[PDB]
Ganglioside-induced differentiation-associated protein 1
Amino acid sequence: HLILYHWTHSFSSQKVRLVIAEKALKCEEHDVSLPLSEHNEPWFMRLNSAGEVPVLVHGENIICEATQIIDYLEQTFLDERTPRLMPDEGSMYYPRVQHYRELLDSLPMDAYTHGCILHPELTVDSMIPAHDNVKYLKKILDELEKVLDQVETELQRRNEETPNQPWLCGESFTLADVSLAVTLHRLKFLGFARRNWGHGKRPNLETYYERVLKRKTFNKVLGHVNN
Amino acid sequence: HLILYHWTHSFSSQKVRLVIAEKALKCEEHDVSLPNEPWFMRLNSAGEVPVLVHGENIICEATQIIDYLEQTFLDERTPRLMPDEGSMYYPRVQHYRELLDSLPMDAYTHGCILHPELTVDSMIPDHDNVKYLKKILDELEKVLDQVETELQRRNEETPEEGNQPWLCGESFTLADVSLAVTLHRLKFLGFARRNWGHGKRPNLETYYERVLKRKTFNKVL
């Protein structure tokens, strides 16, 4: 009874879709994007996140924008069988989850993609077949490393608390996990994964990404996008 | 192909649909409104934003949808609802369109339901106080007087013979869409008699009676 209009390649669309799948909600999803053969240039050449906002229709209500869609889904579907991606607002765990979710959503993925195509010599194993100065790209990638180091320390805390492997903010899969997983998968697509993790660097994050890949929901909604 | 998600009762939805019909665009429209309490009991124009899906683009909000339809469908067969920006007629049409779109329809309808005494012939089977309703109704009368004077100018500029003019000229424009939908909603609420009719605002009265005869207006609304 749900209808979603989205673009497969759209970052925010991927987040919304993963949230739908995690919550075990039957949804009619329509990919408005046209085939590649009709576009003079692929999507990553022309991406505009501000112009590309998915739309959700649930009976009478019509909800634009991905974050609005996710919030509406989290507040509207309170059935006991449907999983919850967010802790109760009264709980002391909600601030942590919300902080990390905001952190991962603030990252400028469009800048990273743009920079990845303009400066392909900074990418490693970029999945593309293949403000504008390289110094700007260097800056934003170092900021990304700071955010990812914060994430690594949080994952280290989680690993300490575990003697049932835990996720980023706890045992339960949360919206912060959705944001982080989609973000890492997009970085992987761009080729910015090797500099940030792997080969003995950020091991907790590497294990996180691998575990995510094995997950049924994530694997059903994603993996086909990269290839 | 075009897809539209809207609410029949929604004011802005009505404007978007009238624009679609006036441009002769084939569109697939879905009424998402439910078949407990009526729509005029609960009103939030900000909550109910229509959405247009045109191939690969998704446009929320009615004004954005209308501007997009005008900028996109540039085929010579498809009529234009706005003059070109370079023209001296475009400022006039844009001013009047903004003037009509600025009106607080939500307030008028909420007050019509709240104060049934003020509606002469409603078609229903500090904002709450009556003074606010009277105040916004007087402002409405001022706006409609501006429209009335513009229509009087149209009458002066048109000869005895020939095609009768619309608000800003001879061609139907977006300002006409806004004005027609506004007048229709006022008639639904019962605020039409106060503003025109019975020798009151004759130019505006004739404008509305001419609107009702338009095939596109009668098909959509």
